[PDB]
Amino acid sequence: ADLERAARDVLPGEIFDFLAGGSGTEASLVANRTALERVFVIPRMLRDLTDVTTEIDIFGRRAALPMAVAPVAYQRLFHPEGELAVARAARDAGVPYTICTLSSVSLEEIAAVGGRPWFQLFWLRDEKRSLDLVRRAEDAGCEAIVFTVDVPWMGRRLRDMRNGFALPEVTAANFDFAPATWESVEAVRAHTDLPVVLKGILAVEDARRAVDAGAGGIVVSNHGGRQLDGAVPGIEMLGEIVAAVSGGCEVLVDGGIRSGGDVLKATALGASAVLVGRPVMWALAAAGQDGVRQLLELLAEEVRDAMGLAGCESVGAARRLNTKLGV
Template sequence: MEENIIPPSFEQLEAKAEEFLDAKPYDYVAASAGAEVTVRQNNQSFDKWQIIPRMFRDTSERDLSVELFGNKLSYPLLCAPIGVQSIVHPEGELASARGAAAMDVPFIASTASTYSLEKTAEEMGEKDKWFQLYWSSDLEIAASMVKRAEKAGYSAIVITLDTPMMGWREKDIDHAYLPFLQAEGIGNYLSDPVFLSRLDKSPQEDMRSAIMLWSQIFGNPSLTWEDLDFIKAQTSLPIVLKGILHPDDARLAVQHGADGVIVSNHGGRQVDGAIPAIDALPEIVDAVEDNIPVLMDSGIRRGSDIVKAVALGAKAVLVGRPYMYGLALAGEKGVQQVLRNLIADFDLTMALSGKKSVRELNRGMLKIQNG
């Protein structure tokens, strides 16, 4: 079985993916901004939070489910939106979506996918899926993407706020590597009627012009909180804001009508030196005062990480790089096995901590290490 090549250890999984992949795509996935301080601290900061297990608790039957936006999720786990997955596996997002669907884990499809959001949705059937929006400077394209996602059966829109432009990623600069310039990761644009209407010739006739247009309209650094009403007017789906690290931004999200927030520093890929996501989480949970759900990503590597994040107030977590390594090594089956390992680890850690349901996880079960 292909999944047998997926080790349970994250460190071994990452090392195996590095051996398997060429340096350019591996570094595009694994590397982060600047000196990569934040990506290291994302992982290390989980160590500060220590679980205090309780004994003589009946954990023979366990409930791992959670509810988000009226939908029941089997686990407090989603696949984070990751673009241009075709650089590590030819089926890219399609294989990841199938792997997530097989494990009953919601898949968040990225705007920066090689395959269109419609094709990705088809792979998942009726399984829960969300769409992540990179808000284009061409507002009509942004609106079109959101409307297409709702029509295709996605159940939430995740707006990534921390990438109005790409961060300073030294390894990508060393490699002179940006896969979008080879037309990978722009499938949602090449299938968008508004984007196509901006071109003099079809991408089949003139791909270079299509790529140039993408480079001009991808990001939008001029956005402010007042602009959120524009996207809200395009869809009836819940709007979740990804990239929140400051409690005041969490309060503004509530004030401006967001339906949820994701505490994230983009896996350390945008601002090197940014606060670790797990350290930002408790303050943001307190700031929203249960008005909207708080999710978290950046640094989820093992089941104990999920336990700690949920205990600190996250309704669910997003996992990123681990499933990409699984995709690289074994396609759809690799994604399945990475998720299976994480879920099993989470289940065991929760039970051995003396908890029988996700709802029982709380801050009282954690102690913060001094110093």
């Protein structure tokens, strides 16, 4: 929330634009926020709140909040401790942390921090390097493979093109790409016992097919407005997708979650959990690990506050809330 100011001041111009930007005219980046702001929660009153809990069970493990840190590449771009600082704060907060394929610190090191790390996979031209990366994540103790499926190639980032931005010095520590298809998903699924989570699903029939394909979860997401410019916001497809999946997998959403109230809105629309991306990096650029820890602490307080004000003692009760679309 606040922190974006501090992030801009301390970060170089091309780095902040890299983090904040979307593709094309940034129509989908802005729409993620406008879609959330149109959602109003209908709160329930007078229910027992003696033991409000924000915990959820997801992928076999208890999480402190219906929330995980979204995969964001090259976190040493924002702070010298990079991914290690975020993973430690996430571990301490009881929240899953998603290790990126393009992390600026190796996945084995991030995983050693503990917590329950997830691993985000970009498909490589080699089915063999891809499946080896999946094996590395699983050997390292990762709890889920978050297969990103909305990047056959990178969308056109006009901020980066204008800046002529390039990665200085930070490296892709996991390395000494190709478009993913449904065959690639089956290959991952056959190669791991970990739940496979498809990130970047927006069509109802792709959500149905993801369940048919054996996915343990999906992330309803337009990649923070960074891929197809003009792609519908995930929050706009979330309710339809939740109904179509009918409990067959976990349904996460991301894009523009900026408060505990937004988490409540996402769960009232039926999400299992949210991912949060840019705000975590603002906290990381502002004050390192302690900055992320404070963000997560504040988010946990706002989620708990919003849930109780809505009459929800549990996240499951929050998913049963009704909503109304407004202006």
